[PDB]
Design a protein around this ligand. Sequence first.
Ligand SMILES: *[C@](O)(C(=O)O)[C@@H](CC(F)F)NC(=O)[C@@H](CC(C)C)NC(=O)[C@@]1(Cc2ccsc2C(=O)O)Cc2ccccc2N1
Lengths: 173, 12
Amino acid sequence: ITAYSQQTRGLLGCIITSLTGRDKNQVDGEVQVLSTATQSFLATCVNGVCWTVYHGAGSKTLAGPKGPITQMYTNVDQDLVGWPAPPGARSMTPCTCGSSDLYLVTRHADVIPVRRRGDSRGSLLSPRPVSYLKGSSGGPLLCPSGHVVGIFRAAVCTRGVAKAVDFIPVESM
Amino acid sequence: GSVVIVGRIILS
Ligand SMILES: *[C@](O)(C(=O)O)[C@@H](CC(F)F)NC(=O)[C@@H](CC(C)C)NC(=O)[C@@]1(Cc2ccsc2C(=O)O)Cc2ccccc2N1
């Protein structure tokens, strides 16, 4: 698995788009880099829904070509929200080959190995600074074949080093 | 206001 990223907006434009709800940029790729005023996170497109963490998006709309997109799925207890994916996003497919060495795609488009530990827990195969994972919530956890098994929720860390991640299973989507 | 897409990640 490889990844590369492409910024599409700067600061002024993010701000105004948030107030208008109206996104006329052409959308593409599997994973959207999102921002509000408060934070920046990711959304994984899986079966034509853009998914992301509830602790990031809250219950807010997603700016779209025609104006704000209402959440179609809002689960506060699973920390999961979903918007109808904007046209152009590349939709991933949920894994089922059931592999257990997994791949976390970050905001910096690195692709870090994660050992599946349980339904929605993983251990990093080599420690990263947690700072490096900041902004990656919502990102995809991939199996070797490129399918999605979930989206990053939370890093478990001590003294600044992320050892394990918590994730929301694709199952729950 | 809205959540805004400010970039993307392409998967290979
Ligand atoms: C995601 O929102 C993002 O930043 O893109 C990640 C952030 C990253 F992994 F750190 N999710 C969060 O940042 C958190 C949101 C919670 C409601 C789940 N929580 C954590 O990941 C957590 C680790 C961490 C983040 C910032 S400082 C820090 C830490 O562990 O010191 C914060 C936290 C507080 C209390 C108990 C557990 C955690 N995990």
